[PDB]
Amino acid sequence: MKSNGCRYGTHRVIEPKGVLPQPAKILNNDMSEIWDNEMLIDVIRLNIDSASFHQIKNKLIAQGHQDLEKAFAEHAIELTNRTGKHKNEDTGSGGMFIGRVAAIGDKFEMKEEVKVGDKIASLVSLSLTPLKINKVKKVLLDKDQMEIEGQAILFSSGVYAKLPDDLDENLALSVLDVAGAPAQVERLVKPDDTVVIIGANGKSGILCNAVAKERAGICGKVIGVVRNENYIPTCKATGCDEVILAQATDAITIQKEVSRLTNGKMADVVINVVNTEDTELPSIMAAKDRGMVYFFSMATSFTKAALGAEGIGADVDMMIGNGYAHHHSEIALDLLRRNSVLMKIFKERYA
Amino acid sequence: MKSNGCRYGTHRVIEPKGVLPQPAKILNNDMSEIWDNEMLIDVIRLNIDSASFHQIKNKLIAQGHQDLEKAFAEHAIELTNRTGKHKNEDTGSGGMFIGRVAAIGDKFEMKEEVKVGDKIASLVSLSLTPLKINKVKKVLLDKDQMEIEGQAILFSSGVYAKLPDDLDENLALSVLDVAGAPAQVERLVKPDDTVVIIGANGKSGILCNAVAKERAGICGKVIGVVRNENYIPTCKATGCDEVILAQATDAITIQKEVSRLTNGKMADVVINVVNTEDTELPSIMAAKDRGMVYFFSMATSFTKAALGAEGIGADVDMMIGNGYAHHHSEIALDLLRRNSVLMKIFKERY
Ligand SMILES: [Cl-]
Ligand SMILES: [Cl-]
């Protein structure tokens, strides 16, 4: 054991010096000893980022290698042994791992309660996790996956999720892709609020549909916005009181339809989960004066949202929606256990 | 006067049919008749966006024009006669204008009280403003300006500010350029708060220093972050109790120094007013758990902010800074009148 570990992981940065683990090039992936505030994981599976997996594979065929599984396995071993992590040297992306807890430092900042032997899922990118690959048992090119024998380091600032026993693995991973949306949405929605959810039929949208209705209450109004009429039954069954049929980029129709459904009062909270570009202004114009706009999708442009509210004089609050919040994994899993209709849809669509 | 005008201004969108004025490519810049919820302005000056002005200027330089002022003047008249607005056709930038009120629609949603003949400043972009240029009196290449004779349309959703009589015109306009900064800061900071302002020496930064200090109070802590030691006296004179010397991109140094100045308690509010890229994570790591991070600068990347907080497990509230708020022009101009230190700095630098 080594004392006084940095919660952000600077103690394992080798090159360049004075930088954080993710932008760094070389990390210390020595697993023979861990710091007092680290957690050691026995990695069984690596879920490499899809764009990174395709770039590595296509780089190998053009070099060019015959057995891609052997070339990819040796490429991952050489990269993680040389750089200390599985960060793509051309793009910069990584991924996440699956494994079992091996050792918990005494000073480790516990988030979700886990003990040694618990099966957990990484929620931070492989571009900052010190990783040591001892053996690649299988390379799954149709799955961007690597069944390996190895160990990884989670810093005290890292995020992880204990995989539950009452749900299968890949199903549990489906809810953690969007677990930050319901955890953050339930903070914004007050009782009797009118909530507009752009993308209510989506993966995170149906979770936000349920959470918005729980928080708004019997006298709140949850309004979904979808593209197709056949999405309406799913929106209502997941919590939406009303459903608007319009394109997510159609600011005028969404504004007028929210206006008609609210008698001009508009929405207290606007949740955007479409992952479609040029949806900032439709979200802004749906909110009332001093309303809240929650941008969960990575397709959001900071410039288009800020300049958008300016040009139309909308004094609204605009949130950069995150993928992490306190206990977000346990909250999202608890939501599915309490709502059988929500759990049914999630298992049939994202098993 | 035409009835049932759209407050967002879609009634003047020509092409394509169904979009808002700003993303639209052709606007109706007719000025013979206005809608009931518009305001007509007699334009005196066009303050083109610097990037747009320099891009158009360099394009004309790279076309082979010998009289640049003439080429730019013709370019603006041709652009506004064809598209109905001075939206840059290559970038997306526009600008703002100065003028005097010519006509006010009956059902115009008044924000700041103005009457016919009042001198006002546009706070919305020219890329959504219907504009008709009748004559370009002079092009000021070194100022990105155009003294013209023309008219512009302000929609009911538009934003404007009445220029005060008790201040120099370019004094007040320097304040309106960052008028949203003090208005939002006095909403974010509670008494006894620890506030970290990254870019405390800039134009909006010194405004944020003063408002943060009066809202945080005698038992609050305002910490400024600047790259140059010479900015310290300005930071402390404008409200900062402590000043950290670090590059705005240096997340590790800011975290360690904020931790030292707060005994590990970190900042309740982090205000980013550096127009510098890759400052999201330095702003995130300065905030305490469940703290507030307000990104004001246009150099902020949404993804870098989203992924930044994920990788280090920061449950912080991150806000897209809004340059508009209720009464932000009157609030900002009043702060300059109340703060002689700020008025002296704004007069000397802007
Ligand atoms: Cl309400
Ligand atoms: Cl750094």
Cα distance between residue A285 and residue A257, in whole Å: 11
* Alpha-helical runs (H) found in chain A: 50-61, 68-83, 169-176, 180-188, 203-216, 232-237, 251-262, 280-286, 302-311, 328-338, 340-350
CA neighbor of A221 nearest in space, from A260, A184, A268, A259: A268
Cα distance between residue B69 and residue B57, in whole Å: 9
Q: What CA–CA distances, in Å, run from A218 to A193, A210, A214, A221, A241?
A: 10, 12, 8, 8, 10
Distance from the alpha carbon of residue B200 to the mean position of ligand 2, in angstroms: 19
Cα distance between residue B225 and residue B248, in whole Å: 7
- Backbone dihedral region of B135: left (phi > 0), alpha (psi from -120 to 50 degrees) or beta? beta
Chain A residues touching residue B314 (CB < 8 angstroms): 157, 324
CA quadruple A317, A321, A327, A328: dihedral, nearest 10: 130
Measured over the CA atoms of residue A186, residue A192, residue A194 and residue A198, the dihedral's sign is positive
Q: Which of A20, A306, A324 sits opposite B322 (nearest CB)?
A: A306
Q: Which CATH number fits domain A180-350: 3.40.50.720, 2.60.40.1080, 3.30.420.40, 3.30.360.10?
A: 3.40.50.720
With both helix axes pointing from N to C terminus, report the angle between A68-83 and A50-61 in degrees, rounded to the nearest 10: 110
Distance from the alpha carbon of residue B247 to the mean position of ligand 2, in angstroms: 9
Quick check: A87 and A56 in contact, CB under 8 A? no
Distance from the alpha carbon of residue B198 to the mean position of ligand 2, in angstroms: 15
DSSP B2: B
At B274, the amino acid letter reads V
Resolution (A): 2.3
Residues 145-164, chain A, touching B (beta carbon < 8 A): 157-159
Cα distance between residue A244 and residue A130, in whole Å: 47
Residue spans per domain, chain B: 10-163, 180-349
Quick check: B89 and B56 in contact, CB under 8 A? no
Quick check: B127 and B328 in contact, CB under 8 A? no
User: Residue B133: beta bridge partners?
Assistant: B150
Contact A306 B317 (CB under 8 A): no
Quick check: B95 and B56 in contact, CB under 8 A? no
Q: What CA–CA distances, in Å, run from B277 to A171, B94, B280, B336?
A: 38, 22, 8, 29
Residues whose CB is less than 8 angstroms from the CB of residue B340 and which lie 6 or more positions away in sequence, other chains included: none
Cβ of B341 under 8 Å from any chain A Cβ? no
What method did the depositors use to determine the structure?
X-ray
**A72 known member of a binding site:** no
User: Residue A320: beta bridge partners?
Assistant: A295
In the block, tokens 């931790």 appear at B259
**B221 known member of a binding site:** no
Contact B319 A321 (CB under 8 A): no
Residues 268-287, chain B, touching A (beta carbon < 8 A): 281, 285
- Backbone dihedral region of A275: left (phi > 0), alpha (psi from -120 to 50 degrees) or beta? left
Cβ of B139 under 8 Å from any chain A Cβ? no
Q: Which ligand has the minimum distance to the alpha carbon of residue B249?
A: 2
Which top CATH class is B180-349? alpha beta
Cα distance between residue A217 and residue B164, in whole Å: 48
Cβ of B16 under 8 Å from any chain A Cβ? no
Q: Which of B123, B252, B312 sits opposite A18 (nearest CB)?
A: B252
Distance in Å from the first CA to the final CA of chain B = 41
Nearest chain B residue to A19, by CA: B252
Distance in Å from the first CA to the final CA of chain A = 40
Cα distance between residue B144 and residue B264, in whole Å: 47
Distance of residue B64 Cα from the nearest chain A Cα, in angstroms: 34
